[PDB]
């Protein structure tokens, strides 16, 4: 029922190899729908989802200029950040940015986001009130002071509470056949002996959307969290996702183990056993 829109900015400096590269990707939930790359032959916002292609040329032209302007701003930020941390001009650095809004089933704003990271570490983030900032270090305190003086947060809030939610609701409507459809996981359990006294039970979950899912193994009704090998949820390449959990069991005790699957597409949690 809940939905989200996210934009992910990535700027990477490359001393001796040109000016910093700027790339942006836009997501509705777990579905990417737009992209932009400053290293492309002709930098422009490009559609990555069928339901966004219906937007006119004025849509793509306007956003392209926004990305180009943001790219230039990021380069200014990167230069400032080096000075904040007393870094030389020889090292490469990364500025990441992610912002967006979360809405409920009625389309009302639940939560807004606007945060930054420098070289993989959190730098500054707009608080949940969308009025104040949280700085990670004394360098980010400089940014905080500058943005507090310019009342930067007010502009962020106006977008997150207005433009962000309104366009998200529009996107959800235009692609409701996909964005508002939850695909349940296709599940099965495999069995492979590693010896004559032990065997591996692997519980599979395939072809599900969205990516959010819970896979657990239980022995005699007790969670086997520590003894469960759980791989990261992975994309299949067809919008859907994959995941599995495995447990090493003594030979002959396979029926004492049960796999539990929870997903939005499932009305009730599933319980699986081997064969």
């Amino acid at each position: 029922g809940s939905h989200s829109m996210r934009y992910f900015y990535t700027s990477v400096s490359r001393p001796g190899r040109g000016e910093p590269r700027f790339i942006s990707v836009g997501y509705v939930d777990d579905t990417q729908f737009v992209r932009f790359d400053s290293d492309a032959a002709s930098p422009r916002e490009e559609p990555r989802a069928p339901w966004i292609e219906q937007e006119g040329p004025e849509y793509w032209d306007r956003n392209t200029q926004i990305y180009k302007a943001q790219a230039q701003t990021d380069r200014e930020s990167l230069r400032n950040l080096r000075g904040y941390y007393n870094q030389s001009e020889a090292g490469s650095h990364t500025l990441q940015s992610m912002y967006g809004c979360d809405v409920g089933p009625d389309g009302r704003l639940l939560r807004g986001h606007d945060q930054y990271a420098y070289d993989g570490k959190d730098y500054i983030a707009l608080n949940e009130d969308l009025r104040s900032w949280t700085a990670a270090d004394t360098a980010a305190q400089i940014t905080q002071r500058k943005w507090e003086a310019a009342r930067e947060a007010e502009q962020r809030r106006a977008y997150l509470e207005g433009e962000c939610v309104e366009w998200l609701r529009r996107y959800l409507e235009n692609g409701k056949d996909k964005l508002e459809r939850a695909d349940p996981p296709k599940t099965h359990v495999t069995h492979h002996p590693i010896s004559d006294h032990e065997a591996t039970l692997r519980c599979w979950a395939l072809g599900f959307y969205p990516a959010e899912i819970t896979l657990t193994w239980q022995r005699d009704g007790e969670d086997q969290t520590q003894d469960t090998e759980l791989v990261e949820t992975r994309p299949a390449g067809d919008r859907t996702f994959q995941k599995w959990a495995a447990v090493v069991v003594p030979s002959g005790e396979e029926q004492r183990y049960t796999c539990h699957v929870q997903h939005e597409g499932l009305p009730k949690p599933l319980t699986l056993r081997w064969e």
Partner: protein, 100 residues
């Protein structure tokens, strides 16, 4: 400067069936910085014209990429993924297992 080594998974889009067309995937994630090189291997040799997703990242700011190509799995043909990163002194090779 703190760096994060990439997590590597090699797998197929659909359950592997010998003789049937499929997609070979190599999903790299949890790495930082974003500079990374990924090869898809068929019997030790690199597969040409492999496509990849647009660079994005998770909530923990760690990047992730999906490399993919069309392939028809057989009994003898071996497939693998070769990944190089600044955190890796040597290229890491992960072999494709049908049940992983």
């Amino acid at each position: 400067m703190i760096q994060r080594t990439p997590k590597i998974q090699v797998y197929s889009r659909h359950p592997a069936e010998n003789g049937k067309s499929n997609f070979l995937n190599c999903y790299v994630s949890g790495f930082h910085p974003s500079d990374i090189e990924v090869d898809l291997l068929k019997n030790g040799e690199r597969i040409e014209k492999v496509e990849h997703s647009d660079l994005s990242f998770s909530k923990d700011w760690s990047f992730y990429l999906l490399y993919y190509t069309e392939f028809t799995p057989t009994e003898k043909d071996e497939y693998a993924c070769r990944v190089n990163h600044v955190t890796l002194s040597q290229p890491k090779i992960v072999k494709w297992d049908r049940d992983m």
